[PDB]
Amino acid sequence: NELPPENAYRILESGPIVLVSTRGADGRANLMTMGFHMMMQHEPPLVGAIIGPWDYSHQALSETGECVLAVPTVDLAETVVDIGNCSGDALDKFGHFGLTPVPAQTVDAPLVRQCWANLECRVVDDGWARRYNLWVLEVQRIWIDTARKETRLIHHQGDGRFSVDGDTLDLGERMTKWR
């Protein structure tokens, strides 16, 4: 199922841990794990992402200007941590971790089938990439696995500790300024 990209805040504002899927100029796919990210703007949908030169993935991001933010659920927690503790420079992470790359619509980086949400992104502003390792991304497309049985997101609290989403609390009726 597809969501309009303006819906990005509804997926990312809450600060889930995410995977960043890339594909190098060489055609090889990779994954890394990212907890330093923000929504920047609702419409157009802009995301701020920290991806530094300590990541092999930084090369593909730099060179190609594309990625997919693949949003995992609680059942993938060990895979997500492990992805964040090894490098794709010499390991096939999709293969190793039993994840399935799926073609994206607007980018050459793959979607991750096992992730509940996949947000196709382009690098729109690299102005602060050198300064802060900050990349401004615009969400192009959003794909949701609406059939998925487990849908709880997890959030990194540092040091490999994660909160698992529990109760949902809907205070929409109080959002009088934001209709």
Ligand X SMILES: Cc1cc2nc3c(=O)[nH]c(=O)nc-3n(C[C@H](O)[C@H](O)[C@H](O)COP(=O)(O)O)c2cc1C
Q: Please give the DSSP secondary-structure letter assigned to residue 160.
A: T
Q: In the set 81, 102, 124, 125, which binds ligand X (CB under 6 A)?
A: 81
Q: Which letter, b or e, does each residue of 22-60 get, where b requires 16 or more Cβ atoms within 10 Å of its Cβ?
A: bbbeeeebbbbbbbebebbeeeebbbbbebeeebbbbbb
Least CB distance from residue 96 to Na ion, whole Å?
26
Cβ(123)–Cβ(137) under 8 Å?
yes
Q: In the set 17, 47, 107, 144, which binds ligand X (CB under 6 A)?
A: 17
Place of tokens 């382009």: 122
Name the residue nearer to ligand X (CB basis): 85 or 168: 85
**Positions in the binding site for a second copy (CB under 8 A):** 9-10, 13-16, 35-41, 46, 48, 50, 74, 77-78, 81-82, 84-86, 128, 132, 134, 136, 152-178
Residue 62, marked binder: no
Interface with ligand X includes 88 (CB under 6 A)?
A: yes
Q: Which two tokens stand for residue 53?
A: 């030169």
Place of tokens 């615009």: 138
| Binding partner at 154 among a second copy, ligand X, Na ion, none, C-beta below 5 to 8 Å by kind | a second copy
